[PDB]
Amino acid sequence: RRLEGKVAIVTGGASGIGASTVRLFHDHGAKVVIADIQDDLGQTLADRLGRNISYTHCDVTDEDQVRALVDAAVAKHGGVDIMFSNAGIVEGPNSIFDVDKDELERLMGINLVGAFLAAKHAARVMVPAKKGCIIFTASACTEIAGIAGHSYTASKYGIVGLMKSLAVELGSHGIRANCVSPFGVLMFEGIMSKVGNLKGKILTAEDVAVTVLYLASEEASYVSGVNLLVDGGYTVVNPTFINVITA
Amino acid sequence: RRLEGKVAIVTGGASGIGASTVRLFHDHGAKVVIADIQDDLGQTLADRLGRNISYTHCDVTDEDQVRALVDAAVAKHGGVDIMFSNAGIVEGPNSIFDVDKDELERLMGINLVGAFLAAKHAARVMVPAKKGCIIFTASACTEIAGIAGHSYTASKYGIVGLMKSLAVELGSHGIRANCVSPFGVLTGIVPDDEASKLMFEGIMSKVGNLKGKILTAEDVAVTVLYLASEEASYVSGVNLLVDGGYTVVNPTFINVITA
Amino acid sequence: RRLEGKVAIVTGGASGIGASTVRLFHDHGAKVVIADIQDDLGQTLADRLGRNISYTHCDVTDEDQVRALVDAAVAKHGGVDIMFSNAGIVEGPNSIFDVDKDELERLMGINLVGAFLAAKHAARVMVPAKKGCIIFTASACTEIAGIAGHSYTASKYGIVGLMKSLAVELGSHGIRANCVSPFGVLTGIKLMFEGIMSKVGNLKGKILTAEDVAVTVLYLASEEASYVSGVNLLVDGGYTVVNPTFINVITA
């Protein structure tokens, strides 16, 4: 009901948060182009959900695959309303001595260059429509340390800067750019229930997906430039002091 | 719908943003008690809105009125799910030479002390329930200067500090706390002249970064609905700006070089 | 001697951070008016330091006392170059059920209302001179929760907002306004406290004292920061940038 008639591309959408966002976008009447490099998962999901969900293989590090992905969406569906640049790779907390220059440049290619390209070509076709919404997947590590590795946090910080620069530029054309910075997805929930600030609730892929839905829906028509954290308050506190003197 | 069976108290709900949230919360099936000091506006709206909408006069600077507001709401409905601490007064851009120690202490009492009290007694009844959501109305001036007066911006900065410390404290009980920072909504700030309205909105469209839509009270209401909905079940500690990116840009540099 | 010929007023300057900044400003050649309400401590410091240090009793809650403080500094010294609004009262981490409306309004008067007044009358004499620097004492609690109480946290946040609008307004007259946000709970803290320092401080091997915070104010007030305005400069050893819970549960 909320996304009726809208066309959304979700890179990295064959699995996890992107797949949860694809299904929820499908439930709200959006035509969704699943983009990923896991072709069996992507094709299986796009067929199971039905006629308005297609799949397109797209390694986001190849600008030509990306340009073609958006161009196939405009030809097939008339245009692109939503670009959910979610394709990335994740590393947990590490040390600066664990950073390998080739691993670093690879992560930067998927995480930062991939977001750059997915934005450029979403912007390429959105600008003439004088409509459009771009949502990147950052990470809660954009507002606190100790929950991701050095290469990962820096790539996600760069997405936030890209998101704000796109919000100002594409704002003149009625186009919004936003981030969602989730906290903990990929025994594991027991560890999450111990570290979360907001106790009781566990963070799931749909939880992040319904937040992307908000940012992409007309309900957030005036939300732009925003890196919306979904962390249950994890990033606003350093409990070390309180633990040493109250526990 | 999204708020069905939930009980929300909305301070400042007799006009503007608070009233738009009352109507929207009402449309989504919540029991809503309008809390305000404009008694004609507040009472008439709650009666016209219907059965699930009550009114309670409450000057938020008076802790006894605030304690009573929540206590009678708990008696009427069993508990409080949502507290939208929205009551406030606004100052436009001014000079530090215009601040009068009384006008400042008055501004602080309504905006910041009211925010503390509305949260204190909302937590009083929410903590035992192990459930609840508290939402404060801050201001876009909490992330940029040049769009509000000194006392007003300082009160809203203090609301943000309060929101984040409540997010940590009440988080142990499954209770969420968040802010909304709107950017110039046509409201009880602006008088009722259609002229005074079209001019406020027209300049807001000029100064706005995101062109092609105007920001209204209902737009802010739908974000409060999001923040209070279970759809934001893991969103806490956040000051969500609704400004179309106004606070992320200083266009002076680019303007000077397009000569 | 970085403050040669400069005249600085330091509210709350009879003790702690304010006293360390008065001494350091004195060492750098500034004429300093100590402003406080601890008259025993306040007068003793201004006399012991020497000829360029006077004292002026001033409750920052009283606009007439503060208006006199600035007017006396102008009378004795020609003008005001630096206003260090340091006067405040402190709360550690607490619960919102511990907040008393009268105690809240008292803290707000000293911490926030006082900062406004010291700025209004510092601006009063700085603007016609088309120069001046106003520095507030905020707190590291302005960037993280859990290291100050609700009332204290909100008052220092309000100082940060006040500082930024003054930075915009007073910038047009060549006047800079900045905050310093120390890690107050850890400043100048026995083997109990030494154990707590190692556990809670992020930058290990070092300790924060009042003298350390004074030199950051010296930096912020000197000409070394001629283009530094609008800044909330933390002196916290990086405490506010990390939530170590996650790695802690998974390293055990």
Place this chain on the structure above:
Amino acid sequence: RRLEGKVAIVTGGASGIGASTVRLFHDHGAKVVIADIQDDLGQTLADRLGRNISYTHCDVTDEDQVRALVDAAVAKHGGVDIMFSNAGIVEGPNSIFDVDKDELERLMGINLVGAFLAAKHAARVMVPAKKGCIIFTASACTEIAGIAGHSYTASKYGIVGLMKSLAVELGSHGIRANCVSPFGVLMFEGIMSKVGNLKGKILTAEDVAVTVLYLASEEASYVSGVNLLVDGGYTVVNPTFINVITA
């Protein structure tokens, strides 16, 4: 003389802000290794200044040169106290349609990958010394839009993220990590005087160097994790609104 006996490496130190910091570091009694790829400027500068200023050519995108830059510096002077990771390239305000994947990757290598490497090998040799300070040159564009290009802005956000996670990790070894984010230093002064928020004063390289001196001095012994802006308040205001309502 605040830096007596301290050893500083300054990448990008043959010109601009890096050269200004080299001279000031020289005046405060530091041994400085000028690191740059402008060999004529860099070698001439290191010779003019004297005994305590040497030169080392170093492309920061080449980890082997960077690993060598630190190792030759430790060999010559005993250790590295200050690492001023200043080497970078600049992009002005532009459009997302102007970003070319190869220019994007080139800028990213110099600005961000250089920052990772320069910190990694400074961290390599600082950690055993249980002392040390790393200072990155970020940018005012990390706190406001409209004053730099998309690729540059994202690279500088990434430096800030790197700095924050390094501040947490290397803090355990008594090592500090901070940024400096200057505004307009790289006809011209009239534009700066009318775009600046703090009127009456103009920002120069000498100004940024003394802020770097502060951050590198022991006067800042408990400052870590900070991105210190030197912008005269430019990033804290959007004056568009007040302009329209004043005349």
